[PDB]
């Protein structure tokens, strides 16, 4: 006697509230970087939707399992280890496109571990990247 509609409304409702609280943790500096990265990763997504889908295809992104998501992480990190700003903005877009594709399957734990560990490796030697997004204007 469980209502499919209510459960998923309550879950989404709380998560939405949890995102807002993560947003207030972003500061003037981080809020602007966000908006600047937003614009870059969006423009990448139109032209390289053709190109990024092919990567989403090579990496079997429908596998939705740690055994594979762990491999997706390793492979993405391997590409960074072999790391200029342009590639970094492209990795972010790739992940956004993995989210777009697997967003209906729901939130799963491995992806979070992936999003954090990749977000982490990208932060390495941020200096070269900060310049890229801030020579826009």
């Amino acid at each position: 006697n469980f209502n499919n509609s209510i459960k998923n409304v309550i879950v989404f409702y709380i998560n939405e509230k949890a995102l807002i609280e993560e947003k207030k943790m972003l500061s003037c500096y981080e809020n602007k970087l966000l908006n600047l990265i937003k614009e870059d990763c969006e423009n990448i997504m139109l032209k390289y939707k053709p190109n990024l889908s092919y990567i989403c295809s090579l990496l079997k992104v429908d596998d939705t399992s740690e055994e594979n998501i762990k491999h997706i992480k390793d492979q993405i990190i391997e590409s960074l280890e072999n790391n200029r700003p342009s590639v970094k903005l492209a990795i972010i877009s790739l992940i956004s496109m993995i989210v777009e594709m697997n967003g209906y399957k729901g939130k799963n734990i491995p992806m979070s571990f992936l999003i954090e560990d990749i977000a982490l490796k990208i932060s390495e030697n941020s200096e070269d990247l900060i310049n890229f997004i801030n020579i826009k204007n």
């Binding site: 990448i44 390289y48 190109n51 990024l52 092919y54 990567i55 090579l58 990496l59 492979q75 391997e78 590409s79 072999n82 200029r84 342009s86 590639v87 903005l89 492209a90 990795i91 790739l94």
Partner: peptide, 22 residues
């Protein structure tokens, strides 16, 4: 199974190239 690994890094290398000029 290494061929899929190569093309992914190869395909990312193009996106960064095109994106460095513009």
């Amino acid at each position: 199974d290494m061929r899929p690994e190569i093309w992914i890094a190869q395909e990312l290398r193009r996106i960064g190239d095109e994106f460095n000029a513009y």
